[PDB]
């Protein structure tokens, strides 16, 4: 380990990170916040933004997104924050009427951006999506009817089978 | 029972854990909790 | 000269049971596990470690490893005369004058049960002649002429790994005393070889001795050695915890009731570490009712301290004052305020308690609590908000904690709603949310649905009990 | 030494002696039992 | 002779909790101090209360005449023992003794109390000896004797009992138990009320009757509510003496709620100017509150905060936090709403959680005694 | 309503277990006949709850 | 309703009083505090328990 300090250090582990960042990931993120923890907060701003930035992102703001774009080319993270918009808009088809009303067009430009390519357009003929009248919906119940059977009975009896069967043999 | 890594390793004080569940809920006040009558 | 007696009876009351009850508990015995010497020496292992050992000062120096570790013989049934030997050696010490033969002159004391004759054929003897010295040298470690021999003497018990893999040729289940030894002296080992520095061929040390314990002897190796590596992996980076993810083989009887109970709560800090809240705080949780007893001062303590951390971090919890050790309290300084911040929505003392002890929040070393400590913040607001009113509006709550704006409060709402706690929706023009809460939800068929689990739960206790009524 | 550990290794399988001691004292203790 | 040494107790917390008279303990203290020769009275207030410009000699002159009656008992215990007879002089120095314990220091107690604790024979030498600990330990902030020389006079002074003194440990640990705030306890043991018009350890029954409102406000239902205090009379003689405590007792009894606010803040002054209470009066404001607004829920569902402003004022965003944090404190079981503003009554008993408890119970009880099975292979 | 009503006095027993050292001539059971009423009775009432998903299909 | 003279719902927003009610389910009530009784016994067990073990 006692080699000479490597040039490229403080960003390889960034590149590392915001590609993790960009590929969805849930615990190499943390064995990340484990192999070298104690430069992270003083320093490494390819760290030390990362981290902070992870923090602002499920603290609930993509538009710290463009404020921290504001600076990051930081050699080449560009095809990585471009992954990162990308992680932005699927995110957006996940998050865009999880449980909500309605959105219009102005929250479409709101969380949304670019205001109108044929890519929210797609996003509205490719989910399965009614483009309501300048107007938006999931479906017309959001939900897909929730009954899941409307017999919650024989199923339960099946188990009272195998459930007295399996205290027949005991005692 | 020490084996493991840990050989290196109600006077006023149960009324503090509903008092706990108090420290951040009006710790005395008696005015606002009796001015609050006359202000209408 | 009056107190070394009480040394001088223990460990004659200890080899006796050991070399010559245990002996012939290897003979021909152990069915499942009659060698209940095993587990007596393993108590008089507790008790020298509850008192000194035998000879770390006791007023002279160097008297009972130089003796007893002579003529064990193991012949014609006047060995019970070699036994006299040792009995009335012990003139020496109360009349004759102490000499210093500890720690220099062992190297052929270690040697001399071999040397006097062909002693006997069991391991379990060679394991006492190798531990019942050489464990009483290692709580010294005062790094001065005595840990490079604590050192050494584990170098004479890695022999005694190469005579725990090549002794008795196949099959005869000696592991049930020295892998019952061997969990004590191989902690022992991590202890001493980490009181200097990480242990890196240890660690394959450590594998191979992992792999030889496989089918074999599968008896209380296998659990104990992984603890071993568990806690290397933990007390350095972080890369082989995929290792028990795609070799999860961690399931034995559970013999010593506390080594799975510790087991649980190593393993319990990987998956807070990994990332958990809900398996990894009943895995604490599990450990913490598994807690054996307290008859141990102030271990549950600080253990404890890193135990509910997770439940810090769900931000359910109240002041957790019931553990408190008043002599942790001058420890807990930081964490009493800590637990006070978790009940407290103040950002400025959010901040404020990590500027007053970012030093043991350092001690603690695990800053995924302060990751993810803010978020906790705002999703005990939301919890208790969210659970209080039906048709809230997100400015009230939002300009309540300080937000500023409609859009980071929607923000808010919509990954709470991806993170599934309550409807609560919005009727969309600027925000002002449109919500409810939820009873009436379901309270009849949902209980038997569990109610399954509960009963089938019981009855497996009860044929647990029945095959537990099978021991005597 | 292929197969000259399983024989030995069931007999370690013999505290089906044991808890069916149990058993067949409780055999005893109960038939007696009745027949008393 | 225990009454002006409670008036000790009301005056050291006189000293303790209100500053806004920050020697009026001095002042009637100092006055209890040169009568009675009492020399605890400037020794405490030599420790707790002020820094004293000058009662050097005019009060060391009387701590030579506390010397005086303290050596005349030092000469009387001799002088009168040549006497066969069994405990009499140790009673008669143990009166004394325990009076110069209310006169001076810890010094009386440890010659007076460790002298006659050991040798006691009879039924006064043990009851004085439990109620002369309970006096100093009702006086300062102490637990272990209130609490365990009743013990002893559960053990000692009992064989069975007598049908009073019995009944003045039941007035003692009621004491105790709105020290701290046992609600049930406290009024369960003042339920006799027949036995303590007024003893030499009642310096006020008045008091007593303030104890038994202040706590049966909280722990006595309304059948029970009833049943004291209108199928009763023997505490309302004295307490309709005290109309407004009547009065706050029947308006909890028909649910009007300013007056709540208003007999409640007479009541939470004084809890504020009553010793026992200090370390506890905190959970009392909330808790009366919520004690009526259990039955105010259980009134209707449809309600609103402008027919219980009618009876809170401008209680709009007062119950914001009041009632939130009534829901956020585990109780108070409702729903409530905004704009639509919604309120719920509801938890019928048998629903989910009586279904509950007993896998609560028998999961780390389970585990519990598992593991305690587990003990017993290896 | 049997099965509430002899159960109290089922669990008067276990106090009588607590003898604290020993102070208890042999076992003196009672155990039994609660488990083995309520295990077939209501092994009937769970094959009754069968018998109309049964008999119905 | 607070006397049990009057078992019902009052109402403020669509002025609806509703009378209803059935409080006794002894097969929940008896059985579970019951049971509670039962943990308090076992409980008193936990000493037997923590006698044969030390």
Redesign the interface.
């Known amino acids: 380990e006692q080699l000479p300090e490597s040039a490229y250090m403080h960003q390889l582990l960034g590149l590392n990170l915001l590609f993790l960042l960009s590929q969805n990931r849930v615990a190499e993120f943390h064995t990340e916040l484990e192999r070298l923890p104690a430069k992270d907060i003083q320093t490494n701003v390819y760290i030390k933004h990362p981290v902070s930035l992870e923090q602002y992102l499920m603290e609930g703001s993509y538009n710290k997104v463009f404020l921290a774009k504001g600076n990051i080319p930081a050699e080449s993270y560009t095809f990585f924050i471009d992954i990162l918009l990308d992680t932005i808009r699927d995110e957006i088809a996940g998050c865009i009427e999880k449980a909500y009303e309605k959105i219009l067009f102005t929250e479409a430009t709101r969380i949304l951006f670019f205001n109108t390519p044929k890519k929210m357009t797609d996003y509205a003929k490719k989910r399965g999506w009614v483009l309501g009248p300048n107007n938006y919906y999931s479906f017309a119940s959001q939900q897909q009817k929730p009954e899941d059977t409307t017999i919650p009975?024989?199923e339960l009896?099946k188990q009272?089978?195998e459930?007295?069967r399996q205290?027949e043999m005991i005692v | 029972m020490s084996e493991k890594k840990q050989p290196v390793d109600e006077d006023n004080w149960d009324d503090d854990n509903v008092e706990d569940d108090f420290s951040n809920q009006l710790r005395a006040e008696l005015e606002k909790h009796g001015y609050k009558m006359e202000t209408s | 000269p009056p107190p070394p007696p009480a040394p001088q009876d223990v460990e004659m009351k200890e080899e006796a049971a050991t070399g010559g009850g245990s002996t012939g508990e290897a003979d021909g015995k152990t069915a499942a596990a009659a060698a209940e010497h095993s587990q007596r020496e393993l108590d008089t292992v507790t008790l020298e470690d509850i008192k000194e050992h035998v000879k770390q000062l006791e007023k002279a120096v160097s008297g009972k490893e130089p003796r007893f570790v002579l003529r064990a013989l193991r012949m014609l049934p006047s060995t019970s005369r070699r036994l006299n030997h040792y009995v009335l050696y012990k003139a020496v010490q109360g009349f004759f004058t102490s000499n210093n033969a500890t720690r220099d002159f062992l190297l052929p004391f270690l040697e001399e049960p071999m040397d006097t004759e062909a002693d006997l054929q069991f391991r379990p003897r060679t394991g006492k002649a190798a531990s019942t010295p050489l464990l009483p040298e290692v709580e010294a470690y005062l790094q001065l002429l005595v840990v490079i021999f604590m050192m050494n003497s584990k170098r004479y018990k890695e022999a005694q790994k190469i005579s725990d893999d090549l002794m008795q040729k196949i099959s005869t289940q000696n592991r049930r005393a020295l892998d019952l030894v061997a969990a004590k002296c191989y902690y022992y080992h991590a202890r001493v070889y980490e009181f200097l520095d990480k242990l890196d061929v240890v660690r394959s040390f450590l594998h191979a001795r992992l792999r030889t314990a496989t089918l074999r002897h599968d008896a209380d190796g296998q659990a104990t050695l992984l603890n071993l590596l568990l806690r290397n992996y933990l007390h350095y980076s972080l890369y082989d915890q995929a290792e028990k993810l795609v070799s999860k083989s961690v399931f034995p009887e559970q013999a010593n009731n506390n080594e799975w109970a510790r087991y649980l709560y190593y393993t319990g800090r990987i998956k807070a570490i990994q990332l958990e809240y809900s398996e990894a705080r009943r895995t604490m949780t599990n450990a913490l009712r598994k807690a054996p007893q307290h008859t141990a001062v102030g271990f549950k303590q600080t253990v404890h301290k890193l135990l509910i951390v997770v439940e810090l971090l769900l931000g359910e919890i109240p002041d957790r004052l019931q553990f408190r050790q008043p002599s942790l309290k001058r420890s807990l300084m930081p964490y009493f305020l800590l637990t006070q911040a978790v009940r407290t929505g103040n950002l400025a003392k959010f901040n404020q308690v990590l500027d007053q002890f970012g030093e043991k929040f350092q001690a603690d070393g695990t800053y995924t609590l302060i990751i993810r400590l803010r978020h906790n913040v705002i999703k005990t607001g939301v919890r208790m908000i969210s659970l209080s009113y039906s048709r809230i509006s997100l400015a009230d709550i939002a300009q309540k904690l300080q937000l500023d704006s409609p859009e980071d409060a929607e923000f808010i709402v919509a990954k709470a709603i991806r993170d599934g706690v309550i409807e609560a929706s919005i009727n969309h023009e600027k925000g002002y949310v449109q919500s409810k809460e939820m009873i009436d939800i379901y309270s009849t068929r949902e209980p038997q649905l569990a109610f399954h689990q509960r009963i089938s739960f019981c009855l497996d206790i009860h044929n647990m009990s029945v095959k537990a009524m099978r021991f005597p | 030494y292929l197969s000259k550990i399983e024989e030995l290794q069931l007999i370690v399988n013999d505290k089906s002696q044991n808890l069916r001691r149990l058993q067949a004292q409780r055999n005893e203790l109960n038939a007696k039992v009745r027949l008393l | 002779p225990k009454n002006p040494d409670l008036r000790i107790a009301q005056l050291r917390f006189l000293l303790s909790l209100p500053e806004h008279r920050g020697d009026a303990a001095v002042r009637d203290e100092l006055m209890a101090a040169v009568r009675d020769n009492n020399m605890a009275p400037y020794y405490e207030a030599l420790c707790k209360s002020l820094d004293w410009q000058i009662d050097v000699d005019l009060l060391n002159k009387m701590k030579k005449a506390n010397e005086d009656e303290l050596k005349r008992l030092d000469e009387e215990l001799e002088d009168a023992e040549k006497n066969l007879g069994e405990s009499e002089i140790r009673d008669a120095m143990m009166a004394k003794a325990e009076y110069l314990c209310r006169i001076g220091d810890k010094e009386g107690a440890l010659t007076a109390f460790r002298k006659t604790y050991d040798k006691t024979v009879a039924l006064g030498h043990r009851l004085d000896i439990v109620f002369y600990l309970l006096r100093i330990g009702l006086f300062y902030m102490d637990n272990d004797l209130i609490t365990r020389n009743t013990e002893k006079a559960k053990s000692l002074i009992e064989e069975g009992g007598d049908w009073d003194r019995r009944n003045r440990l039941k007035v003692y640990q009621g004491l105790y138990c709105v020290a701290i705030r046992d609600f049930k306890q406290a009024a369960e043991l003042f339920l006799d009320t027949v036995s303590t018009f007024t003893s030499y350890e009642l310096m006020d029954y008045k008091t007593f009757v303030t104890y038994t409102v202040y706590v049966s406000m909280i722990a006595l239902e309304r059948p029970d509510l009833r049943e004291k205090v209108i199928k009763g009379a023997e505490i309302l003689e004295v307490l309709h003496s005290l109309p407004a405590v009547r009065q706050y007792l029947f308006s909890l009894y028909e649910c009007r709620y300013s007056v709540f606010f208003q007999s409640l803040a007479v009541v939470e002054q004084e809890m504020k100017k009553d010793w026992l209470f200090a370390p506890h009066y905190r959970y009392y404001v909330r808790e009366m509150r919520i004690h009526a607004y259990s039955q105010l829920l259980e009134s209707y569902r449809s309600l609103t905060l402008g027919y219980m402003a009618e009876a809170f004022g401008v209680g709009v965003e007062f119950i914001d936090q009041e009632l939130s944090r009534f829901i956020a404190a585990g109780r108070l079981h409702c729903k409530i709403d905004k704009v639509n503003e919604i309120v719920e009554t509801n938890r019928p008993d048998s629903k989910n959680w009586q279904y509950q408890e007993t896998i609560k119970k028998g999961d780390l009880l389970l585990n519990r005694v598992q593991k305690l099975s587990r003990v017993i292979n290896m | 309503?049997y099965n509430?009503a002899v159960?109290?006095e089922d669990?008067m027993t276990?106090?009588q277990?607590?003898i604290?050292n020993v102070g208890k001539q042999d076992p003196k059971r009672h155990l039994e006949e609660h488990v083995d009423v309520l295990?077939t009775s209501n092994?009937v009432q769970?094959?009754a709850?069968?018998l109309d998903?049964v008999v119905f299909k | 309703i607070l006397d049990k003279k009057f078992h019902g719902i009052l109402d403020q927003g669509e002025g609806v009083l509703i009378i209803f009610d059935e409080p006794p389910v002894?097969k929940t009530y008896?059985?579970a505090l019951?049971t509670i009784?039962?943990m308090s016994?076992?409980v008193?067990?936990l000493?037997?328990k923590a006698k044969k073990l030390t």
């Open positions: 009975s024989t009896a009272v089978i459930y007295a205290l | 309503n509430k159960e109290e669990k276990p106090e277990l607590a604290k295990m092994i769970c094959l709850a069968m998903t | 002894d008896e059985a019951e009784q039962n016994k076992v008193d067990s000493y037997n």
